[PDB]
Amino acid sequence: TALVCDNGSGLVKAGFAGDDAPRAVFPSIVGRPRHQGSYVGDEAQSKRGILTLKYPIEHGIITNWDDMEKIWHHTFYNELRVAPEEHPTLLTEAPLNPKANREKMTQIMFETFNVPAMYVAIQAVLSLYASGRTTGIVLDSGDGVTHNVPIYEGYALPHAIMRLDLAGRDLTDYLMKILTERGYSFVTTAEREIVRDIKEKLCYVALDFENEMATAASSSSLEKSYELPDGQVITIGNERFRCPETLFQPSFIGMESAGIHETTYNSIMKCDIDIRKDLYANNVMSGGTTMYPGIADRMQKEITALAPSTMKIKIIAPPERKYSVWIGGSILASLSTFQQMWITKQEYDEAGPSIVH
Amino acid sequence: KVAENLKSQLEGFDKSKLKN
Numbered sequence: 001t002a003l004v005c006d007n008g009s010g011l012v013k014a015g016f017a018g019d020d021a022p023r024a025v026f027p028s029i030v031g032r033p034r035h036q037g038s039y040v041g042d043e044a045q046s047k048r049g050i051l052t053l054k055y056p057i058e059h060g061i062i063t064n065w066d067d068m069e070k071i072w073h074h075t076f077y078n079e080l081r082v083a084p085e086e087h088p089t090l091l092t093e094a095p096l097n098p099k100a101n102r103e104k105m106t107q108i109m110f111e112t113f114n115v116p117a118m119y120v121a122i123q124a125v126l127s128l129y130a131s132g133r134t135t136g137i138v139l140d141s142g143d144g145v146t147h148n149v150p151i152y153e154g155y156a157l158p159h160a161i162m163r164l165d166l167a168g169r170d171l172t173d174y175l176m177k178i179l180t181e182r183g184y185s186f187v188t189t190a191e192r193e194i195v196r197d198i199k200e201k202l203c204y205v206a207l208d209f210e211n212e213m214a215t216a217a218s219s220s221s222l223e224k225s226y227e228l229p230d231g232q233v234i235t236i237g238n239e240r241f242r243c244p245e246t247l248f249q250p251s252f253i254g255m256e257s258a259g260i261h262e263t264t265y266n267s268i269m270k271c272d273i274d275i276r277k278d279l280y281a282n283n284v285m286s287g288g289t290t291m292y293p294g295i296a297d298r299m300q301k302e303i304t305a306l307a308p309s310t311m312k313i314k315i316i317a318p319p320e321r322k323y324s325v326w327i328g329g330s331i332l333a334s335l336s337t338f339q340q341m342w343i344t345k346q347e348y349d350e351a352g353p354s355i356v357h
Numbered sequence: 358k359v360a361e362n363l364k365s366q367l368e369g370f371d372k373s374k375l376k377n
């Protein structure tokens with residue numbers, strides 16, 4: 001049985017092909033000490049007070065291979081409890097992953113973990129597959145990175161890919177900051193995980209930011225309360241929608257980038273004029289940070305205002321978005337027609353890292 | 358451009374069949 005490992009900028013989602021959900025999900029964090037002369041995932045977040053935390057995949061691309069090798073080891077042995085030697089392994093990569101990087105992942109899988117076969121697929125493409133499409137444009141917003149990825153007949157169009165270094169983790173930090181400014185304190189681990197939970201539970205995307213501000217200014221109807229496990233009650237109203245509003249207005253956190261509606265449109269306009277109508281009718285959202293209530297409606301509205309007045313625009317937000325990359329891998333790796341697409345260790349031993357391309 | 362039978366399997370896949 002093949003393995004599916006989605007190497008997330010914030011969370012590893014790993015599991016077995018043909019399953020409907022990952023078995024393991026844990027932070028892609030490696031932690032170490034230092035104040036008076038290595039751990040992974042949860043036990044790195046857990047007792048971290050004696051740890052400096054690092055993201056080896058901070059923005060979707062793997063930048064530290066020793067730490068990544070630790071993550072993968074944790075994944076195989078500690079989370080899935082499998083012998084890597086026994087399972088074909090499908091790995092995910094970010095859009096615009098450099099060739100040497102994909103070569104490096106391939107070598108590690110064969111020469112370190114001795115997998116019998118492997119494959120590397122683009123996350124956004126897997127999400128599109130998961131929704132039953134091979135043409136469309138994906139907005140993938142995860143933990144450390146957001147991409148727009150137009151895909152035609154199963155192929156991501158590299159020159160049209162957009163990247164925004166703003167996603168779930170930044171929205172968490174932003175909510176923390178604005179709550180801190182109001183006088184609340186979050187120093188520990190959960191706090192700050194409590195702030196993450198507040199974000200997930202109470203935040204939403206306004207259909208019209210200014211109108212929602214007016215509503216929050218003139219009534220108490222958007223106020224919501226969250227109880228902290230010591231007695232503190234934090235109440236928030238406009239911060240519920242101001243926080244994810246950052247995705248559409250990155251200036252909220254001092255970033256000069258265009259927002260996710262503008263990058264979606266710019267991505268489409270980089271594509272062959274002949275496929276744009278198919279991209280506009282197939283905007284698929286994926287990733288945890290697209291889970292906000294209202295985000296599809298807002299994207300429908302913003303893309304409509306940017307696109308030609310006639311254009312048919314559809315946003316598809318699958319209920320399972322949060323794991324659709326992983327699920328796309330699960331489907332892909334179980335398909336009969338995929339089984340000769342595996343790179344075998346024999347194919348590898350005969351040609352080296354360059355086979356993946 | 359992905360092979361045709363693969364596209365067909367992807368586009369027509371029935372997400373039941375996925376083990377719980």
Ligand SMILES: Nc1ncnc2c1ncn2[C@@H]1O[C@H](COP(=O)(O)OP(=O)(O)O)[C@@H](O)[C@H]1O
Pocket residue numbers: 007008009010011012141142143144145167168169172196199200201286287288289290291292322
């Ligand atoms: N219901 C939710 N609402 C808003 N954000 C969410 C929700 N669920 C998860 N997230 C956010 O999604 C991010 C992780 O999503 P994911 O797609 O796994 O990231 P990655 O693949 O980059 O690791 C986290 O920041 C998490 O807070």
Ligand SMILES: [Mg+2]
Pocket residue numbers: 008009123142143287325
């Ligand atoms: Mg992801």
